[PDB]
Design a protein around this nucleic acid. Sequence first.
DNA 1: CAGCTCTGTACGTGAGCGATGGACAGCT
DNA 2: AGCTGTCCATCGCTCAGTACAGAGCTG
Length: 197
Amino acid sequence: KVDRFNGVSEAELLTKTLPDILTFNLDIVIIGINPGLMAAYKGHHYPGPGNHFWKCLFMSGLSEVQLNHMDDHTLPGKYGIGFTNMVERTTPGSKDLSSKEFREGGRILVQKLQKYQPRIAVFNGKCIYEIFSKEVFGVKVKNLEFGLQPHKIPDTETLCYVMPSSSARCAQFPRAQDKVHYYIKLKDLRDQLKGIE
DNA sequence: CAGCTCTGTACGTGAGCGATGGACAGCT
DNA sequence: AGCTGTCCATCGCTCAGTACAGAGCTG
């Protein structure tokens, strides 16, 4: 058998969770789908190799140096960026999650965003915004788009911004290069909000 | 018919793991 | 010269959401 987790079983990782990294007065909260096996293993956000997050964060200029998963706790203080996931349960991919889990996640998430009130709630995955939009805004569009959404988190000024998942499982944006446009537009939106305020 | 939701399926890239075998140094 | 074992370059295999077609349902 192939040992991908230094002798730790996949069964053990499936029982692990990934802590939120949230504070008040954040500019951005990156909302993932759920922990993958490596994030559950490490206890940090978006570790490699099958994930473009840290590469895109650097390539877009959101970080001035190339960071990695071990730097995740430094992001609120240094960059005004926090982290959560729609679903707590660890799985190898998003396809293993049920509709009920996603809708439970959505309820807990809107409550968290209403508490921390970041300037921008970033959905790192179209699939989770599809569910969130229907559940929270009661809206289901034929052609859901990426980028800035025309809805704020209820009872807050928090914007919703959607990006294709940073997971390299997605063949439609095969490289970190193919997703960086969305991170650049995220930086532009952040800089623009900090201009008026 | 015509919309809608639900399920099944196919899809590009770059990286860790395990297998392979050529290059080569240490020994006699 | 002949043998043997390690190193390590390199390769194949596997892995880390989204769009879309077609079935089933319903207005």
